[PDB]
Amino acid sequence: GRLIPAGTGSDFVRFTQVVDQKTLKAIEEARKEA
Amino acid sequence: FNPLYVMAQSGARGNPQQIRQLCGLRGLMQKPSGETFEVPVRSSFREGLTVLEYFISSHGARKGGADTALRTADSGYLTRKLVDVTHEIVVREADCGTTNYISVPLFQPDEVTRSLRLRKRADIEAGLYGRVLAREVEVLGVRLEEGRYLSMDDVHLLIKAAEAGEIQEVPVRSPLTCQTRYGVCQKCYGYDLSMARPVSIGEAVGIVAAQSIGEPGTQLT
Amino acid sequence: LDSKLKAPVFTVRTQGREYGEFVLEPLERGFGVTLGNPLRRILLSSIPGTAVTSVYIEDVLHEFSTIPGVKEDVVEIILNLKELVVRFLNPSLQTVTLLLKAEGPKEVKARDFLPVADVEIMNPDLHIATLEEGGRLNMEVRVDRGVGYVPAEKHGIKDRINAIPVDAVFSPVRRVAFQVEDTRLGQRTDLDKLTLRIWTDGSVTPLEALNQAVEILREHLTYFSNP
Amino acid sequence: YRAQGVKLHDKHIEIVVRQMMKYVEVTDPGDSRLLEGQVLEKWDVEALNERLIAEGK
Amino acid sequence: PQEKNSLKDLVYQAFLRLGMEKTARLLDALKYYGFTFSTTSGITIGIDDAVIPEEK
Amino acid sequence: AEPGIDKLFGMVDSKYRLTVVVAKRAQQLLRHGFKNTVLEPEERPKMQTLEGLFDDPNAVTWAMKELLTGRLVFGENLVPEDRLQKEMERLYPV
Amino acid sequence: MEIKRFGRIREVIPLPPLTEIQVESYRRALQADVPPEKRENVGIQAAFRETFPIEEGLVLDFLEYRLGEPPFPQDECREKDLTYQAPLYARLQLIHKDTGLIKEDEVFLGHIPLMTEDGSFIINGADRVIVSQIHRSPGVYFTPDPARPGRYIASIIPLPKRGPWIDLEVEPNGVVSMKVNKRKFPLVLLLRVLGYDQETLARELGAYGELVQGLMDESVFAMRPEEALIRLFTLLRPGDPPKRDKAVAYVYGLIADPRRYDLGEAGRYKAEEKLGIRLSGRTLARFEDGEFKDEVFLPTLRYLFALTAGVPGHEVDDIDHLGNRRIRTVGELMTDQFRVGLARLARGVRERMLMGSEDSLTPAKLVNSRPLEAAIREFFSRSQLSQFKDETNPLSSLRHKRRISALGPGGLTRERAGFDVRDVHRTHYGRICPVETPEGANIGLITSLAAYARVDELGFIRTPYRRVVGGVVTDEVVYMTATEEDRYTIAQANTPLEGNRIAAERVVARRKGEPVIVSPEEVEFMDVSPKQVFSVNTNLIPFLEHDDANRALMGSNMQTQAVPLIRAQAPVVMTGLEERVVRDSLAALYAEEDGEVAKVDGNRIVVRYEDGRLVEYPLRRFYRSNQGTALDQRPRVVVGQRVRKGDLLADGPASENGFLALGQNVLVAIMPFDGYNFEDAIVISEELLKRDFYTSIHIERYEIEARDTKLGPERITRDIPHLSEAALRDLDEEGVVRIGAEVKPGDILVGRTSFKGESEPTPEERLLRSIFGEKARDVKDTSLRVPPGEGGIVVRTVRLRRGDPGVELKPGVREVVRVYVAQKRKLQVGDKLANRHGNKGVVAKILPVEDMPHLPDGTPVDVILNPLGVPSRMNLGQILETHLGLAGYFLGQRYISPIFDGAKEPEIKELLAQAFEVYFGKRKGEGFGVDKREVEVLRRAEKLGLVTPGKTPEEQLKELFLQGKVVLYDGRTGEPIEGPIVVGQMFIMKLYHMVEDKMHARSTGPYSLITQQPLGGKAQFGGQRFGEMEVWALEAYGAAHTLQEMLTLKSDDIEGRNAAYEAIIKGEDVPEPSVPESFRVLVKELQALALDVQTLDEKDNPVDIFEGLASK
Amino acid sequence: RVDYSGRSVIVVGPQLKLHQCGLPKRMALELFKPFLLKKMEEKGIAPNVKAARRMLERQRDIKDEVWDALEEVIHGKVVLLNRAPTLHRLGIQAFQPVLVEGQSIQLHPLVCEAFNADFDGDQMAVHVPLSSFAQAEARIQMLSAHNLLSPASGEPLAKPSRDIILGLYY
DNA sequence: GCATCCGTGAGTCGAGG
DNA sequence: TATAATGGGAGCTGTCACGGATGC
RNA sequence: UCGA
Ligand SMILES: [Mg+2]
Ligand SMILES: [Mg+2]
Ligand SMILES: [Zn+2]
């Protein structure tokens, strides 16, 4: 009953992340200040 | 503009044989043993058949029905066997980097054994369209590069070049020669035939294969 | 049992004097094509417009001949003349003859026609003929007010012996296409949505065209009055 | 499939046939732990063989 | 004249050149007009529509 | 077909990556109540109601439309997961 | 309306009673009208004679038996869910040989189910049918050895479970082997035991190829029959001590014992005819004067050697021949199970005789009837050949009763199914119908008996033929078997006859099934009718000769599925069989004798016959059938009406004035319509619903039980906790819904309260209880409600309560309530319609009248069928029918076309012209000319070459009308269809498959016990099975989340599904799934197999999916 | 066996766009039921979930606002239609459902070839993808309009046939 | 090396009692 | 709790072809 | 047994 290793379950495409730019720079400044 | 003619010719419905049974003679029939009666039905469905004729045809009809009913089970079983044997195969990467390939012949030995003749268009398309070239091919002043996914026009072109006697066989990346473990790669596979574009990594081509072979199982006669 | 029907809103969407869309919803079951088909028939047959009925060209005997010094044949010219959109400003005017005389290395447009009182050419940039060095074009074209579409061999009019009859396209409307879609108001399921699309030549607008069409129809309903 | 007028790409049949050709049988163990007549995967015997070749065996 | 094969070819070409969205729209169009015209075409089947040739 | 689907297939290297991107983004939108949307008020997908046009309740529609704009970024290892979560929670409370 | 009939073939004899294969069989088996001393040795009498006497008092013998009267009438049996049956008594006498004491008594053996008049049964209040089985007739057969080409196998087959199959083969080493119970031993041995000597066998068999040396073994002839007998016993029974009497007992029981080994009467007949011998008994040998005497074996071996050598007059056998295949009818199957139960009773007897006081034993003390009772009950309930009766329409019942299965007990396993079985044999002619048979897995197995076909006393099927002497056809009819038929040249029924003499110089005939052209001098016999070749259902298809067999099959089969319509009509075009089917099905009600009708009522008809006697026939009204179709008779006569013998009184269900009505006659047009008829789909007019065409009544039975519980009694009550008056509105004082009320899904039929399971209220329940200050009720609402998508008007209510007269229920049950809910169903989108020609389709569109294609006179068509269905399906009959229908529309008349001797094209053209005069001349007289649109269409037809140019509009319109085509106007436009369209009357039925019954959906519902996956079925509010192949689909698509979702959240993941539902109702996205419960079940079931299944991480350290609950 | 899955008799869909199918009101009511409860709670139709469900329990307690609410629910979503036997991946396809009266499922004429479905009384099963992921997969990957070509041959699997071809030819 | 027995497989979903 | 009693008895049959162990 |  696990997720099959194909399609949306392929290790190639499944770890992909989505972030809107507005949040992206907001994290980038946190990485920039530290 | 006759309705039967039109429907048959357009591919809307009907084939020459059914139409023939309608306006023609019904034709020869088989005995239960597969043996054929010496006396054919001379009647169409328009004219109507004698009871004897009808009875004679019933043998064939029944045999056909039984054949189909028995065929569906075997087709299904086969399909499941294929699904089971191919299920782990999925495209796992872009390139396995193999230098190995297969050569699709454009010519086959004639039954007369006189010479080699051009294979049928559909067959060539079946062994060609969508595939990636494993080597440079120069024909009719055209450069088909190593790594090129053959479009339909590429295939037709190769057919033309073959008719011109420039090329007898086409080197191509194939799953037979793919070195990818547990699956195949993108290049060895080629087009995702549904999208007519290179296959997306993660497409399960084993199941697609099994289904593609199995599906017209019950059609085979 | 009891049925109450809300008034149906009428909508319009137009692009220039050429094209428009017309939406009428909701309508009772079946009334989508009840309104649709007649208006289409009326719009194609009955809408008043102007057409090129007859054409005379100097030194030209019949329709299939060839004109020295000009590139397009008599056929092609007549075709271009079919696409001429001419508008009558004075409601009195029933017909006009337009004259055109030009020569030498020139491309004749619809602008080249000598202006007539209360006669407007909507498409002056329409091409008529290309002439070369030593080319000469003298032509008189007849323009009549009428409706629908009359082939050249039906009206069969000639002012002179060499005047060629032209298939007369009177209808300012080039196309009418309607489509009825199912629509619902509350729990009323089967109601109709009428969407009408009208192409004209610009002499009459689609909206005007549709307004004339509904007027004609209404006027016919009054014919059931007096036995 | 051609006889019945079914257009089918060689690709799929190749996948299956490949899966039939998945296996091999040992004709001699050499320096391995395997046995004569022992059946195994072509991939595994190729990996083992490259390991033994890299090991100088 | 437009038949099964030619229409199939049209769908393939349109898929290639114009993509699947436009090919979808094309398919719906073809469906609509095909149906509409087939309705009024006058196509029917009578017993006299099966024509026994003399040559028989 | 989904509007502009050909372009969406053009964006990724594999269709399934597109799918994952869309779905994840849609979950982001659902969790934050769309407050994180990159769509301008005019670009908002609308649903026709008995009253009038309202916002489209379907986060996947939104996701694909946003993706079409180019205002979204997709890829592997762009940021630690908990950092992304906490930052989005900071900017857009749930 | 005038009914015109075609065809020149005069049927000499009518069809035999169509239910006789059932009725006469069971009657032959019971012999209940025959005085006990006059009965024969066949049937249950045979069973008694076989079982008794019982020996080792030490003797109990059978004298006679008797059947009493049924304790309850048929209708009362249907009411109380009892069985229609008669008490079986048997005269027995106990005899102690020494004492000489004789004690005689009549013992009660239980009850035997009685067959009703129509040939059906009632078992537990449900009508059922016993389907005749087909099998290989017992006898001696000779078959080619598939391995050795020039060698053959002899096979001696007895009746099923009547003893073993025996094989005689000639071994490669030359010796002749016998095979019994899978043991190969030399036949010579048994031959010696039979008392044969080398001399006798040498003089008997010697003439064949010097092959007899394979039969010669000196070690066998060197020993007397006793030694060879013990030898054979040692060969057949290893480890069993070879005692003499034990060997005699075993061998006798294996071969000569009639109480064990039995060939059929047909078995012995065919044995005798094949081997050219005579059989004293039905066994292979005898025990006579202490020794075994031969009957079968030597002639068998003789014929075998003769066939092997090539001696003329010897031939192999076709085992699919209908002379080698017989039919076990109701009586034979019932007799078999009766025999088994009786044998069990005998074992009980012998077991009782040894024990107990040896002095006082009555037959009553010896006989336990229970095994016999159980045998019969079993045969009538759980048998495969005992089927729930199909009563949908009368034809369903009839055809059901006329079925022949190759399956069932003693019959072939599906696996054993092969083509040779399923094939249509040449000998099926006139016996088993070549058409009627199911599509799919069951094809060629389930078949149907031909119309004229009869089953004789030996179980074989026979068909009638007319005697022809010197070119003169007599009226003498001879029913032959296939073996008999093969002896003659038999002419076709359509051959020209002037008077009784054959008028053709060349006549078409059959010799051994082979078609042949012969002279009248050569013609021995002639067919009775084309009707004899097909089944009853197939005989109902007009223009059958114009239909391809495959579709005709579908028409035939689909007639059985026809729902009786309130408005139902006999077909415009009939085959002439529609009256008989109504009669033999006991559907309608007729006049017993001549007389005058006194009373006519909805509920009854009273008739005074010529005797002066008053006979009152009650009418069955709105009775629910097995399939839920309403069966009711309506009176067709009036007060004072003079009637003769056989005249109609009432019309049964699906009957119009005594003719079979399976459907409606509708005006149909064959044209494509806007893709709504695309791929067999159908477009219908709202005017069909308006006038109630295709509208039928359906009754559903609901049931509930109030029983005794350990937690206290369930009781039907109007007092139901937490329900408003709005809920209890239609419920009476006792809690049962009132007659005449309308019920919708969710409504209560029977109110019921049950005592709650022991409650340990959760703290939430207690706090809420305190908040609202209301004591938790003792009982709870168990009331039977209306299942989703069901409903109607309450018609009857039955209440059976314990403690009330005539009423006793199953133990623990206080009372049982049944609510009958009927409904009047109109035709709707998704319902299935079909015609007699195999054209079947779902209604996809219902158009308002103004959208329907209409005739110039303003008449809208009913059904619009797509022409694309015709050519591929090759059934042209439906076309022809329509054409004739067209004429019949304007002449106001119906027709009878004998199939195969019907209405030819020219005559239909004549009728069509006569119709055209009515259709047109009326118009021209009414002061109307030809329409402009008609002119346009005519121009369009001229280009088509459908009309000759230059003729007048009227002449051309007639030309088209003769071809069955008319001008049609589109109702949406008013513009004509560019071509002329085929339009006319067609007979179309609504089938039993209706979208109302089939539409089902579920969000969440009941789960299976062990697997915790959703239940299957609509009744269970089940889920859709997502199979392996659907998983394949989702995989191939590559949607992992949808798939995993199916495998977990939507099926057996309990935490996951609860969390899913909660997430969705909360407006949250669904949580990630966890381990499906059925995998845990897999793990645990593997552990019980002593296999350790360990889920591990990547570090190979175990992961507990049971969360510590299973670990100590 | 799965939850959130219906079945019914198919009927021709000619007015449908390629991406659509007719889904009966009641079928969708049951299949979408929890979403319908939540949506009913969002609007003024019901005070809470339990009351809403008790409201949907009896047919005479059901009112138009719940149908409109159901329309609001299904917006943008698709369902999976499947016909047995499923021989290849096109035996299941994704369709944006369009609510219809009556008990029948409306299927688009162009997909009938891939399903090997016809109108002779065939039936199809419906499945509602739940998660946003399932929905995304169904809509991008499994949508009817998104697979026009056979994965096997490569030729168009969605093409004119029967009446369509007939008309265009005519 | 070559007969022979034994075990195991032989299409999907749905309906009804 | 006491005459004496001592080896059972249903199988049951129109497939089928594969593979992999078992005997001249 | 029936339906696809
Ligand atoms: Mg409408
Ligand atoms: Mg079908
Ligand atoms: Zn590779």
UniProtKB/Swiss-Prot annotation, chain B:
Assembly, per entry: The RNAP catalytic core consists of 2 alpha, 1 beta, 1 beta' and 1 omega subunit. When a sigma factor is associated with the core the holoenzyme is formed, which can initiate transcription.
Binding-site positions, Zn(2+) 2: 96, 178, 185, 188
Source taxon at top rank: Bacteria
Taxonomic lineage: Bacteria, Thermotogati, Deinococcota, Deinococci, Thermales
Full protein segment contained here: 1017 to 1237 of 1524
The protein's role, per its UniProt record: DNA-dependent RNA polymerase catalyzes the transcription of DNA into RNA using the four ribonucleoside triphosphates as substrates.
Name of the encoding gene: rpoC
UniProt organism field: Thermus thermophilus (strain ATCC 27634 / DSM 579 / HB8)
Entry protein name: DNA-directed RNA polymerase subunit beta'
Family as reported in the entry's similarity comment: Belongs to the RNA polymerase beta' chain family.
Bilayer-crossing regions: none
Swiss-Prot record, chain C:
GO BP, sorted A to Z: DNA-templated transcription
Gene Ontology cellular component list: cytoplasm; DNA-directed RNA polymerase complex
Enzyme class: transferase
Keyword Lyase belongs to the record: no
Swiss-Prot/TrEMBL catalytic activity: RNA(n) + a ribonucleoside 5'-triphosphate = RNA(n+1) + diphosphate
GO MF entry, a single one: protein dimerization activity
Transmembrane domains' residue ranges: none
UniProt-listed Enzyme Commission number(s): 2.7.7.6
Keyword terms: DNA-directed RNA polymerase, Nucleotidyltransferase, Transcription, Transferase
Keyword Lipid metabolism in record: no
Superkingdom of the organism of origin: Bacteria
Region (Alpha N-terminal domain (alpha-NTD)): 1-227
Family: Belongs to the RNA polymerase alpha chain family.
Quaternary structure annotation from Swiss-Prot or TrEMBL: Homodimer. The RNAP catalytic core consists of 2 alpha, 1 beta, 1 beta' and 1 omega subunit. When a sigma factor is associated with the core the holoenzyme is formed, which can initiate transcription.
Function of the molecule: DNA-dependent RNA polymerase catalyzes the transcription of DNA into RNA using the four ribonucleoside triphosphates as substrates.
Domains (record comment): The N-terminal domain is essential for RNAP assembly and basal transcription, whereas the C-terminal domain is involved in interaction with transcriptional regulators and with upstream promoter elements.
Name of this chain's protein: DNA-directed RNA polymerase subunit alpha
Species the sequence originates in: Thermus thermophilus (strain ATCC 27634 / DSM 579 / HB8)
UniProtKB/Swiss-Prot annotation, chain F:
Catalytic activities: RNA(n) + a ribonucleoside 5'-triphosphate = RNA(n+1) + diphosphate
Gene3D superfamilies referenced in this protein's UniProt entry, alphabetically: 3.90.940.10
Keywords attached to this entry: DNA-directed RNA polymerase, Nucleotidyltransferase, Transcription, Transferase
InterPro entries from the UniProt entry: DNA-dir_RNA_pol_omega (IPR003716), Pol_omega/Rpo6/RPB6 (IPR006110), RPB6/omega-like_sf (IPR036161)
GO CC, alphabetical: DNA-directed RNA polymerase complex
Top enzyme class: transferase
Keyword Zinc-finger: no
GO BP terms, alphabetized: DNA-templated transcription
GO molecular function per UniProt: DNA binding; DNA-directed RNA polymerase activity
EC number(s) reported in the record: 2.7.7.6
HAMAP family documented for this protein: RNApol_bact_RpoZ (MF_00366)
Function (record text): Promotes RNA polymerase assembly. Latches the N- and C-terminal regions of the beta' subunit thereby facilitating its interaction with the beta and alpha subunits.
Family: Belongs to the RNA polymerase subunit omega family.
Assembly with partners or alone: The RNAP catalytic core consists of 2 alpha, 1 beta, 1 beta' and 1 omega subunit. When a sigma factor is associated with the core the holoenzyme is formed, which can initiate transcription.
Record protein name field: DNA-directed RNA polymerase subunit omega
Organism: Thermus thermophilus (strain ATCC 27634 / DSM 579 / HB8)
Gene: rpoZ
Curated annotation (Swiss-Prot), chain G:
GO CC annotation terms, alphabetical: DNA-directed RNA polymerase complex
Family the UniProt entry places it in: Belongs to the RNA polymerase beta chain family.
Job of this protein: DNA-dependent RNA polymerase catalyzes the transcription of DNA into RNA using the four ribonucleoside triphosphates as substrates.
GO terms of biological process kind: DNA-templated transcription
Molecular-function GO terms, alphabetical: DNA binding; DNA-directed RNA polymerase activity; ribonucleoside binding
Primary gene name: rpoB
E.C. designation(s): 2.7.7.6
Reactions listed under catalytic activity: RNA(n) + a ribonucleoside 5'-triphosphate = RNA(n+1) + diphosphate
Naturally occurring in which organism (per UniProt): Thermus thermophilus (strain ATCC 27634 / DSM 579 / HB8)
Keyword annotations: DNA-directed RNA polymerase, Nucleotidyltransferase, Transcription, Transferase
Subunit composition and interactions: The RNAP catalytic core consists of 2 alpha, 1 beta, 1 beta' and 1 omega subunit. When a sigma factor is associated with the core the holoenzyme is formed, which can initiate transcription.
Official protein name in the record: DNA-directed RNA polymerase subunit beta
Domain of life: Bacteria
